[PDB]
PDB file of C-alpha atoms in Angstrom:
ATOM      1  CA  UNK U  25       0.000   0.000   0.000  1.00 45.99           C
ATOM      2  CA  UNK U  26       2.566   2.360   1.182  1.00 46.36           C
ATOM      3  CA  UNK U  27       4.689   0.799  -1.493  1.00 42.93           C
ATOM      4  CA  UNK U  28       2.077   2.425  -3.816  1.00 42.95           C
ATOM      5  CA  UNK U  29       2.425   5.484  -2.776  1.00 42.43           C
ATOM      6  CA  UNK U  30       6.486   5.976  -3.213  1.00 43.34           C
ATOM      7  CA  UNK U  31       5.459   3.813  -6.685  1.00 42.49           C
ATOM      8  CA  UNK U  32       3.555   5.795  -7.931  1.00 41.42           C
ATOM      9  CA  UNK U  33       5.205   9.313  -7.211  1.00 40.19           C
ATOM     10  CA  UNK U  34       7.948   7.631  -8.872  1.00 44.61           C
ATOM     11  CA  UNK U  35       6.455   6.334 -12.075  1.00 47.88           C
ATOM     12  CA  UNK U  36       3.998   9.752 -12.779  1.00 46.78           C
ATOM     13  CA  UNK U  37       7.820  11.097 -12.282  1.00 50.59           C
ATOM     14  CA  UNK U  38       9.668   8.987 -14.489  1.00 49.97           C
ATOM     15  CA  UNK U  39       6.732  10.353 -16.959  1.00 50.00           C
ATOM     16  CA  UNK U  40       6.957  13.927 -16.321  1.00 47.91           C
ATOM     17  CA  UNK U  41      10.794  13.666 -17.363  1.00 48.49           C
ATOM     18  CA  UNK U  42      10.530  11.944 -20.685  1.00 50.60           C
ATOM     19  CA  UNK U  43      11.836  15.083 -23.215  1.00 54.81           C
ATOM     20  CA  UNK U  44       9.431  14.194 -26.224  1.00 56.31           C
ATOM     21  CA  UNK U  45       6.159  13.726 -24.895  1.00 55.83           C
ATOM     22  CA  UNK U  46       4.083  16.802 -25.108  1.00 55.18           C
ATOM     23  CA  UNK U  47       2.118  18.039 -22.013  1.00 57.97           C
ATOM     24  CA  UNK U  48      -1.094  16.996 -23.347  1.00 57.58           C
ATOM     25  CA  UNK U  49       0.319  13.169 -23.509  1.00 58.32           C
ATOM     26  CA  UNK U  50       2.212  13.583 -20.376  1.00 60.38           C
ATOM     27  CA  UNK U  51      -1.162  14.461 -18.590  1.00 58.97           C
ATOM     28  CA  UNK U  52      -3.315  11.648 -19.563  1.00 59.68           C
ATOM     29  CA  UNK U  53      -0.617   8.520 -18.377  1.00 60.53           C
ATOM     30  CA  UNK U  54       0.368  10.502 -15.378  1.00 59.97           C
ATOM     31  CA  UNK U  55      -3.453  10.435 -14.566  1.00 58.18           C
ATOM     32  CA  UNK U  56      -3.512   6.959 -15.115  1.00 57.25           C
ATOM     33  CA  UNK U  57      -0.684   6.000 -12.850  1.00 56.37           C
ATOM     34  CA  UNK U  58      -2.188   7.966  -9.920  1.00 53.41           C
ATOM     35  CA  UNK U  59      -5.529   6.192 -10.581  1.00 57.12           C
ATOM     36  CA  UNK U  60      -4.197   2.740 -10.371  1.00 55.81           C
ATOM     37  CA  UNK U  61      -4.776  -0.024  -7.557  1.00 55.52           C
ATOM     38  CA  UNK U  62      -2.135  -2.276  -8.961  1.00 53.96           C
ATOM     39  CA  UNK U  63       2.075  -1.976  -9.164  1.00 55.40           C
ATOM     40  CA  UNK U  64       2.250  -4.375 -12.105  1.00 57.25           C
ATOM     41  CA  UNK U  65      -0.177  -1.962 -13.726  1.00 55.46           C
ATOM     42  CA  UNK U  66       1.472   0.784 -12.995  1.00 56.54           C
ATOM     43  CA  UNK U  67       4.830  -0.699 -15.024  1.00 55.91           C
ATOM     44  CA  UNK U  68       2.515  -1.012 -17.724  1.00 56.20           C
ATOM     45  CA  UNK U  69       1.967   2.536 -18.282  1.00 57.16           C
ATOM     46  CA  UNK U  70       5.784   3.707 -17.426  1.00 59.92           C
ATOM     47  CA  UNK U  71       6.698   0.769 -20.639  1.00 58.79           C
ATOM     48  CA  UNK U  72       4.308   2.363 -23.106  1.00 59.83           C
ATOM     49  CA  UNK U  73       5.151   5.990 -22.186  1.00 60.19           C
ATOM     50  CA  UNK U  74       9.031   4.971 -22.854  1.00 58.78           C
ATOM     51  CA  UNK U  75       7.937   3.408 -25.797  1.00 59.95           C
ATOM     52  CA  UNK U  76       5.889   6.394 -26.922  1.00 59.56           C
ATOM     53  CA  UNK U  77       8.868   8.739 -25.893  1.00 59.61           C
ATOM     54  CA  UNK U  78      10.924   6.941 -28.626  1.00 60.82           C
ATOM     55  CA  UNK U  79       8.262   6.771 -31.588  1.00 60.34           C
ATOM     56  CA  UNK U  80       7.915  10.827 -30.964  1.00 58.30           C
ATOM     57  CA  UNK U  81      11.675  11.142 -30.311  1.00 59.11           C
ATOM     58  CA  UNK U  82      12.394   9.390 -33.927  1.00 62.73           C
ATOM     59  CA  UNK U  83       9.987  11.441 -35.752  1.00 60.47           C
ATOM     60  CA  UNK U  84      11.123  14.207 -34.060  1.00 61.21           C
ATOM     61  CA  UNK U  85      14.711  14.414 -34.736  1.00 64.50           C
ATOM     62  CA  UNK U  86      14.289  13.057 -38.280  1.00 62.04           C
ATOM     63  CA  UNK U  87      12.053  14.970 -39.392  1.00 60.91           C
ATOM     64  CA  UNK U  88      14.550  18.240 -38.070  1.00 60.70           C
ATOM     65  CA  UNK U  89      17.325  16.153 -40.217  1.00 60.25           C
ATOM     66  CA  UNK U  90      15.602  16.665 -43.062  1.00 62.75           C
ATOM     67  CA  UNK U  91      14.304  20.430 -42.477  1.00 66.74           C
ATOM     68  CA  UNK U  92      17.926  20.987 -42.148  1.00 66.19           C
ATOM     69  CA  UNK U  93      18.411  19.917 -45.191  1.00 64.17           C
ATOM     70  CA  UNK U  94      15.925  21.907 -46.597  1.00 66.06           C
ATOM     71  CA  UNK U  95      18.043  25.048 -46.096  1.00 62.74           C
ATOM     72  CA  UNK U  96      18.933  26.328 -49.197  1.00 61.83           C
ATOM     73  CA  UNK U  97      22.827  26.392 -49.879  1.00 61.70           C
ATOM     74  CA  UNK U  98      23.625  24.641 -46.628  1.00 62.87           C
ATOM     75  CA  UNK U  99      27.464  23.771 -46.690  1.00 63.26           C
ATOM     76  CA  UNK U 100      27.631  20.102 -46.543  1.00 63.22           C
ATOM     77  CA  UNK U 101      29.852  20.339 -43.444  1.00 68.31           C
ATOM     78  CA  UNK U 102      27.381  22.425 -41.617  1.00 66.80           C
ATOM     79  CA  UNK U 103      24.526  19.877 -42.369  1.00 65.87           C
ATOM     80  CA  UNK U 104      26.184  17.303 -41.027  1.00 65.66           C
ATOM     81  CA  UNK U 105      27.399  19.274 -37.916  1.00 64.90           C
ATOM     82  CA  UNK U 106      23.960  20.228 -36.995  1.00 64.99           C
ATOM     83  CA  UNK U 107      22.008  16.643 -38.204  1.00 65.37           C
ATOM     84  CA  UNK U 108      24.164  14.866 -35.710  1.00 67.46           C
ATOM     85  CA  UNK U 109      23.846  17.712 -32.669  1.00 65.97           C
ATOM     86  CA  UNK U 110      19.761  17.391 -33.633  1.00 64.87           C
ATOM     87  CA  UNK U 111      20.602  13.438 -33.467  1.00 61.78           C
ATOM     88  CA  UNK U 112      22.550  13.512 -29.941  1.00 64.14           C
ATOM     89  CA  UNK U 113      19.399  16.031 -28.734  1.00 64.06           C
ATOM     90  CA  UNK U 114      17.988  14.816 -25.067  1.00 64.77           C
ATOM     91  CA  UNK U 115      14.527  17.244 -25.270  1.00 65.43           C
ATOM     92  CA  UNK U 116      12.652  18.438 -27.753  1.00 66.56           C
ATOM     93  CA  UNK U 117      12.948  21.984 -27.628  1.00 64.96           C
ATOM     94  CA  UNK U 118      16.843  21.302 -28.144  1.00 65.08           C
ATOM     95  CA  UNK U 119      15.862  19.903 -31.101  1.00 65.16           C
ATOM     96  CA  UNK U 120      14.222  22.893 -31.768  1.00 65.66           C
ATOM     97  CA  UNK U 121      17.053  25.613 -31.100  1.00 68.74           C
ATOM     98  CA  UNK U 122      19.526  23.285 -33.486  1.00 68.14           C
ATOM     99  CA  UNK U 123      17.074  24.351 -36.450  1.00 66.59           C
ATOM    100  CA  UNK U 124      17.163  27.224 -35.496  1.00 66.76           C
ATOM    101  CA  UNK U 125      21.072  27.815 -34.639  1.00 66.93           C
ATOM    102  CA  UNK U 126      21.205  26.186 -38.293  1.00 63.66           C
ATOM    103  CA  UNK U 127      19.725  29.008 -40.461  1.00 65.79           C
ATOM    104  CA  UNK U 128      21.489  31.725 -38.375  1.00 70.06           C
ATOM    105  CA  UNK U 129      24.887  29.915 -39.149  1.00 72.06           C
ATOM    106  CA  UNK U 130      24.135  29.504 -42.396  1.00 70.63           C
ATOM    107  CA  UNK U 131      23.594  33.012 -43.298  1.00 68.66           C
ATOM    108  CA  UNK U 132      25.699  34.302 -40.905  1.00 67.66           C
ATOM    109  CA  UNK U 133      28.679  32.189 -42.793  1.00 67.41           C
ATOM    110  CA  UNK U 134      27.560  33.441 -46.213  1.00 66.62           C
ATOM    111  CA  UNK U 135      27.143  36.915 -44.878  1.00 63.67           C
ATOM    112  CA  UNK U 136      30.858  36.844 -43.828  1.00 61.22           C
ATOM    113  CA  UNK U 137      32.407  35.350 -46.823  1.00 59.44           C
ATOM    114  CA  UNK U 138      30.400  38.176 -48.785  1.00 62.13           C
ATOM    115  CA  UNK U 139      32.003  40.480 -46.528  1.00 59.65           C
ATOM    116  CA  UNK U 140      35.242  39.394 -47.134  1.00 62.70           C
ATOM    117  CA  UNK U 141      34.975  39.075 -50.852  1.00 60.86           C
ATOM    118  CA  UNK U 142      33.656  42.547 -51.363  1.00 63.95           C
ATOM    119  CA  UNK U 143      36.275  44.277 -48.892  1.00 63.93           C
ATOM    120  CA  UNK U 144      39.328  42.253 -51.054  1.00 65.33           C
ATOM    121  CA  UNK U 145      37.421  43.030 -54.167  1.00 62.92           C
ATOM    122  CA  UNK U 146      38.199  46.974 -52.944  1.00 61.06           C
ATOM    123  CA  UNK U 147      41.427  46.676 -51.513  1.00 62.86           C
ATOM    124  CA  UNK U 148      42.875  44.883 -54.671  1.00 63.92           C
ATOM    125  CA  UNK U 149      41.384  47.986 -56.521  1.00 67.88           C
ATOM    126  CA  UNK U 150      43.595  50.680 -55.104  1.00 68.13           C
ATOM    127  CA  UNK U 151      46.986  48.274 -55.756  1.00 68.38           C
ATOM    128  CA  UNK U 152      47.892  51.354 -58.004  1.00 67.68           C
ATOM    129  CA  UNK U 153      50.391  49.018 -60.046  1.00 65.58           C
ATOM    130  CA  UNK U 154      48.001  46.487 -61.409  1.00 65.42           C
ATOM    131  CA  UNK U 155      47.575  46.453 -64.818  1.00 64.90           C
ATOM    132  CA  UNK U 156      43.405  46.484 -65.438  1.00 66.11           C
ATOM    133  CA  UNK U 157      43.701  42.870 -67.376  1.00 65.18           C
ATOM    134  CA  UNK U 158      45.651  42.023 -63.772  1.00 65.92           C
ATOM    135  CA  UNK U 159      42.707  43.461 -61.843  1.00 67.67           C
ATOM    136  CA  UNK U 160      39.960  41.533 -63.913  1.00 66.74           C
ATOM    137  CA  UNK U 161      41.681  38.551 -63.682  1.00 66.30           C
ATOM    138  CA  UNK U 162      41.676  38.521 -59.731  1.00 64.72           C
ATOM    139  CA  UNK U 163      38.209  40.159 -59.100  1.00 66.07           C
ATOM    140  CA  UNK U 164      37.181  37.362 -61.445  1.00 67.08           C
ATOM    141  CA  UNK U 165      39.203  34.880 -59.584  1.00 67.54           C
ATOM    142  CA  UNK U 166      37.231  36.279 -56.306  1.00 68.41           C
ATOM    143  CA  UNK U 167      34.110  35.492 -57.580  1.00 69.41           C
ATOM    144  CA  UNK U 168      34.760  31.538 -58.510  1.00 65.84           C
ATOM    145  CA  UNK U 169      35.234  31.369 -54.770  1.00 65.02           C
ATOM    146  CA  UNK U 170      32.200  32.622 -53.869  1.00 65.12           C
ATOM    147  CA  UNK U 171      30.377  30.731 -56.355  1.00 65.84           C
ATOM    148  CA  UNK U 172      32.653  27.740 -55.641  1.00 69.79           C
ATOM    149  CA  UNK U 173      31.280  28.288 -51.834  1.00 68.65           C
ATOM    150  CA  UNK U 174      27.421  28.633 -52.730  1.00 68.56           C
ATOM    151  CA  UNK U 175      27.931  25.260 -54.674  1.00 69.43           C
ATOM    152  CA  UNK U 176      29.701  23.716 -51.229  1.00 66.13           C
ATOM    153  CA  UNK U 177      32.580  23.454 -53.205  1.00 67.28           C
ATOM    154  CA  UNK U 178      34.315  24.732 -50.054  1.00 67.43           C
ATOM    155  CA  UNK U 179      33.501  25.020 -46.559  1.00 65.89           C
ATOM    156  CA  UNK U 180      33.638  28.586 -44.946  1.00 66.92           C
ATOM    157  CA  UNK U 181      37.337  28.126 -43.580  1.00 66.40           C
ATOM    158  CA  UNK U 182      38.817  26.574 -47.346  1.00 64.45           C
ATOM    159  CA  UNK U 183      37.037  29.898 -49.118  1.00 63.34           C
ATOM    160  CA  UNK U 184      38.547  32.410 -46.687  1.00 66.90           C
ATOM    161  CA  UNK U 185      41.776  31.236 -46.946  1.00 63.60           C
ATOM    162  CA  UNK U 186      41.334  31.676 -51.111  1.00 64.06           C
ATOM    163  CA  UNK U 187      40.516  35.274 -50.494  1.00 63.91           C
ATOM    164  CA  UNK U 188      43.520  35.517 -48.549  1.00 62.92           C
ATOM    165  CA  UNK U 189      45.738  33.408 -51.252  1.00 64.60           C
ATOM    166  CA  UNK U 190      44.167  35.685 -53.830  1.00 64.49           C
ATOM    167  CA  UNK U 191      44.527  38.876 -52.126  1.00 64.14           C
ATOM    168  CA  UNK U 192      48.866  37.852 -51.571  1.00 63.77           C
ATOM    169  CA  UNK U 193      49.538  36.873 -54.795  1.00 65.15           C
ATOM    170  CA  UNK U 194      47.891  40.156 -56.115  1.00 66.77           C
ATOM    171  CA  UNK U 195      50.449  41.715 -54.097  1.00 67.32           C
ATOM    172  CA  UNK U 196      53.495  40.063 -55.213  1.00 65.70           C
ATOM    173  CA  UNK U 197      52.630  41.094 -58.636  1.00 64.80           C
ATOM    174  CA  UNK U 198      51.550  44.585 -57.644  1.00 67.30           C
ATOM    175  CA  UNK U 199      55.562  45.120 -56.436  1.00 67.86           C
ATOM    176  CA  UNK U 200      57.658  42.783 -59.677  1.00 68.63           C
ATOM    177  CA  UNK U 201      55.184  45.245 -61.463  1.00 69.72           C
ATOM    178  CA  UNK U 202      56.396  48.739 -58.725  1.00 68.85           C
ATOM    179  CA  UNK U 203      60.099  47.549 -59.409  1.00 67.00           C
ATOM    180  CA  UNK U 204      59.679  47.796 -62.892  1.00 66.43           C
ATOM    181  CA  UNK U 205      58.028  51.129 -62.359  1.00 67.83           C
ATOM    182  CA  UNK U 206      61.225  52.155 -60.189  1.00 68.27           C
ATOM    183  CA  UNK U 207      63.973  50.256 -62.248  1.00 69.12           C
ATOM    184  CA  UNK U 208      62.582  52.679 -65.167  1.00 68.30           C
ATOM    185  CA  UNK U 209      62.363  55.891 -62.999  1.00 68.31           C
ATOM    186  CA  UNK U 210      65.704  55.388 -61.593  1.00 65.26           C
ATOM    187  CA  UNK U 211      67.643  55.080 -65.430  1.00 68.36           C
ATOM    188  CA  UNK U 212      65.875  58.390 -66.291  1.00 71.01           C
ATOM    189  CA  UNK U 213      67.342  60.110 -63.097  1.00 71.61           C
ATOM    190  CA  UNK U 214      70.392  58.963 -63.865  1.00 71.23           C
ATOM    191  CA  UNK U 215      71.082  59.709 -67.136  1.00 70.50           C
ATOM    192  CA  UNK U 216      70.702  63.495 -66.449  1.00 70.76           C
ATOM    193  CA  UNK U 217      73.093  62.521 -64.006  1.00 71.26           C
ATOM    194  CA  UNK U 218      75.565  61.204 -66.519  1.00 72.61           C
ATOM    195  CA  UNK U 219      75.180  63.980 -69.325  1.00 72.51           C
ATOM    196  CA  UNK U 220      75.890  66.859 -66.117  1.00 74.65           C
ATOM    197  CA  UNK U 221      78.973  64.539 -65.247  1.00 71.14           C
ATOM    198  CA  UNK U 222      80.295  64.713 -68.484  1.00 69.98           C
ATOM    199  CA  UNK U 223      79.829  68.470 -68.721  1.00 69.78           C
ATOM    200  CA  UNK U 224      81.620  69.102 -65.352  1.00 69.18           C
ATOM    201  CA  UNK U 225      84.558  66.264 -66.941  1.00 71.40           C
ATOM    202  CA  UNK U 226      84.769  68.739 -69.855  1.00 72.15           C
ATOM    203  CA  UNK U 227      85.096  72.144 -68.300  1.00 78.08           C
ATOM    204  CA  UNK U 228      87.282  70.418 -65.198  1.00 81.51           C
ATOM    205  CA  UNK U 229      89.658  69.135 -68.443  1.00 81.36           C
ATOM    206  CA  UNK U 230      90.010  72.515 -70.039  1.00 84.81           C
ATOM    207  CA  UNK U 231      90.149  74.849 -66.755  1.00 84.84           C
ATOM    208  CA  UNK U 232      92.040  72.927 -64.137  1.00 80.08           C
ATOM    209  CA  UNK U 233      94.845  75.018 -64.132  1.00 79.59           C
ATOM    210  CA  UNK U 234      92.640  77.894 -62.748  1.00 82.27           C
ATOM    211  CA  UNK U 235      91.381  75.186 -59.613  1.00 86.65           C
ATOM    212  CA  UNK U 236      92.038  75.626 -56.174  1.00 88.05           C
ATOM    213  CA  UNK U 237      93.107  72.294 -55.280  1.00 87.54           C
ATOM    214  CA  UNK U 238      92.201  70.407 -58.457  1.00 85.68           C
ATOM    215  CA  UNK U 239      93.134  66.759 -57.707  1.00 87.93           C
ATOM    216  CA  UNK U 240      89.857  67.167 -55.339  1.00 86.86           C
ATOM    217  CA  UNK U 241      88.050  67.807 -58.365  1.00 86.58           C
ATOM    218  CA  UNK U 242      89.574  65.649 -60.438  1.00 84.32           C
ATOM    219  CA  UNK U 243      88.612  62.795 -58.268  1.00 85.57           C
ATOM    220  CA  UNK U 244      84.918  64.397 -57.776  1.00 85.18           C
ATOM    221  CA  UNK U 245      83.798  64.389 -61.502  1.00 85.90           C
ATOM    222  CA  UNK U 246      85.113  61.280 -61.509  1.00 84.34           C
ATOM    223  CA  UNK U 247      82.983  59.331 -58.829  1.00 84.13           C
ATOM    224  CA  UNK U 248      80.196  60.499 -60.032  1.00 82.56           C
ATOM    225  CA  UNK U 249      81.126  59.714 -63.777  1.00 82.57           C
ATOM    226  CA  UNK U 250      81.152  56.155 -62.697  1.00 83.80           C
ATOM    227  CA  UNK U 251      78.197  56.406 -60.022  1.00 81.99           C
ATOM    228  CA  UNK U 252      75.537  56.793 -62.708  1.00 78.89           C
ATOM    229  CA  UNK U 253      77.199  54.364 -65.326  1.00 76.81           C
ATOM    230  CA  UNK U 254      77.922  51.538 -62.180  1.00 78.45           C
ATOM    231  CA  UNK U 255      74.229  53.025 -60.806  1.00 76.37           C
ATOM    232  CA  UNK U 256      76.282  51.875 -57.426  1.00 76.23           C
ATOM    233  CA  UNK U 257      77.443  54.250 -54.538  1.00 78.32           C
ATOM    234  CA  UNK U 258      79.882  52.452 -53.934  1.00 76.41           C
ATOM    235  CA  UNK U 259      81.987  49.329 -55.965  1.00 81.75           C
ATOM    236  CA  UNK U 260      81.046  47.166 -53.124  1.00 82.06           C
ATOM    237  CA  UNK U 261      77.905  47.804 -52.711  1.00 80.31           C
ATOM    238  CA  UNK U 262      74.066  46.789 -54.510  1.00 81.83           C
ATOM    239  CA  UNK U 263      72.845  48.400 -57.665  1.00 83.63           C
ATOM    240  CA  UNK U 264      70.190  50.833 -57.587  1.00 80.39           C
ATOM    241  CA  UNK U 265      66.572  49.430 -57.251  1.00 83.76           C
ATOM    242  CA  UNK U 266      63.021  49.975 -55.828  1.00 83.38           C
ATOM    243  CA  UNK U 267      62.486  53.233 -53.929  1.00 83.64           C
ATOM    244  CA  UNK U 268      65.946  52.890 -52.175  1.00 86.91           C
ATOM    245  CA  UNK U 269      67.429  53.127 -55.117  1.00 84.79           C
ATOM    246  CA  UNK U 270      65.704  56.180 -56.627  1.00 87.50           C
ATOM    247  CA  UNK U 271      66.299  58.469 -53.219  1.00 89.02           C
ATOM    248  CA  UNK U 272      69.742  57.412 -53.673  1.00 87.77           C
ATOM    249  CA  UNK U 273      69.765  58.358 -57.144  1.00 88.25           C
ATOM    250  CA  UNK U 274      67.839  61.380 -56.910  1.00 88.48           C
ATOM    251  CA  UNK U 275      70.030  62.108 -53.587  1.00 89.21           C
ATOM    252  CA  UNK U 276      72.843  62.203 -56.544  1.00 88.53           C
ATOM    253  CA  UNK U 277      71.555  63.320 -58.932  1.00 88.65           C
ATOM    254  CA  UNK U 278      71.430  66.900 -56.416  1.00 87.78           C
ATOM    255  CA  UNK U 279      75.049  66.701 -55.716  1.00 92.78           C
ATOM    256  CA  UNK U 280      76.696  66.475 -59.224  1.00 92.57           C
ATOM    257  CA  UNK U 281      74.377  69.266 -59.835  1.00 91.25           C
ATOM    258  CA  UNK U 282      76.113  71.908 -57.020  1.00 92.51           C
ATOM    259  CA  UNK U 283      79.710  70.394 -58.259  1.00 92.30           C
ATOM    260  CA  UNK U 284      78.655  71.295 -61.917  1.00 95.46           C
ATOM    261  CA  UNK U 285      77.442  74.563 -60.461  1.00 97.40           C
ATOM    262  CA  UNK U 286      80.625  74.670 -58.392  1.00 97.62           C
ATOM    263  CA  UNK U 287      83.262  74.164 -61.255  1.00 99.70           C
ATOM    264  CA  UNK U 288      80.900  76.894 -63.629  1.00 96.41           C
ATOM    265  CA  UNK U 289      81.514  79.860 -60.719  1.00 95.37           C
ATOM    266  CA  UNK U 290      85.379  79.155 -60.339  1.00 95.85           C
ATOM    267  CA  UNK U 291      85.983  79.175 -63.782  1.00 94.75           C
ATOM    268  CA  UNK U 292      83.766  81.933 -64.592  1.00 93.80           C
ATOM    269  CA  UNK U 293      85.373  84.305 -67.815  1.00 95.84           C
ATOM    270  CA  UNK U 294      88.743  82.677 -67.706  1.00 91.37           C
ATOM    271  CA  UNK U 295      89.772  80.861 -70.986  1.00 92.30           C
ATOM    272  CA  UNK U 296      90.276  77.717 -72.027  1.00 94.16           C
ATOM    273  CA  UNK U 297      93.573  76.468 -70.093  1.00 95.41           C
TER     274      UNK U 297
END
């Protein structure tokens, strides 16, 4: 009798626990256990609510499987992450938040990568020294990613680190394509360079005689005579290149000019010996 009554608190408990019976079903067997003169009955009702439990805990999570499913462009990785949380689910409402958590990932994850895309897409534009058939060919290249993604081609982390691959190699070819740009700057510089050092040869050849100290000169013109033909500062030392280079060469470029300007005021009105 007693028996009974710790019996049946437990087995209308047992019922009230089960996490995918509804309330409606929960209320009619706990009402039956509490209504019941017999034990062996009462394990009769506790079976068939367990067995109830797992018909509506099947249907339940497979039928979320398949919603999942059912959302459109769903990265294969991210159905599978969320079919087997929905499949490990103790409740139903769990079952219900992993639907939902789905959809919010799954735009979330295509919101980013669009994001990401876009904001490359822009900061490849401004990479001054990219030809424009360069720039197609990598905002084009962008764009296979993100159609490669929507097709689940790629999972989110495999597409960002495309746009990242894509973005550094249009880098690498915006600077071969800058030290070009330089190389070219920097022959122009100095070759005025040369032509002055060849006029301040000439008048330090026909007016030395007139120099204060004119081994100093001599030894002037000719460091800078071989400066802009080596394009080295020194004979042990790198040739000119990239925007090193072209301060260097502009820095001498400044210098032969006050020695030319230097040699023109000493031998100002003298003649030619």
């Amino acid at each position: 009798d007693q028996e009974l009554g710790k019996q049946s608190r437990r087995s209308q408990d047992i019922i009230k626990s089960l996490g995918f019976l509804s309330s409606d079903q929960k209320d009619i067997l706990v009402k039956s256990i509490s209504s019941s003169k017999d034990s062996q009955l009462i394990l009769k009702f506790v079976t068939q609510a367990t067995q109830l439990n797992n018909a509506e805990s099947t249907k339940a999570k497979q039928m979320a499987q398949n919603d999942v499913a059912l959302i459109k462009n769903i990265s294969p990785e991210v159905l599978e992450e969320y079919k087997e949380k929905i499949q490990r689910a103790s409740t139903k409402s769990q079952v219900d938040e992993f639907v939902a958590e789905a959809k919010k990932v799954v735009n979330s994850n295509k919101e980013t990568l669009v994001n990401q895309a876009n904001g490359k897409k822009q900061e490849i534009a401004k990479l001054e020294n990219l030809s424009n058939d360069e720039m197609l060919r990598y905002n084009t290249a962008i764009d296979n990613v993100v159609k490669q993604y929507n097709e689940g081609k790629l999972n989110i982390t495999a597409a960002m680190n495309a746009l990242n691959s894509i973005k550094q190699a249009a880098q690498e070819v915006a600077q071969k394509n800058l030290q070009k740009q330089y190389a070219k700057k920097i022959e122009r510089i100095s070759s005025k360079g040369l032509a002055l050092s060849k006029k301040a040869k000439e008048i330090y050849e026909k007016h030395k005689s007139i120099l204060p100290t004119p081994g100093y000169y001599a030894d002037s013109v000719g460091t800078y005579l071989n400066r802009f033909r080596d394009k080295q500062t020194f004979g042990n030392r790198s040739v000119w290149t990239g925007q090193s280079g072209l301060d260097e060469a502009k820095k001498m470029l400044d210098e032969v000019k006050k020695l030319l300007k230097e040699l023109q005021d000493l031998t100002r009105g003298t003649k030619e010996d």
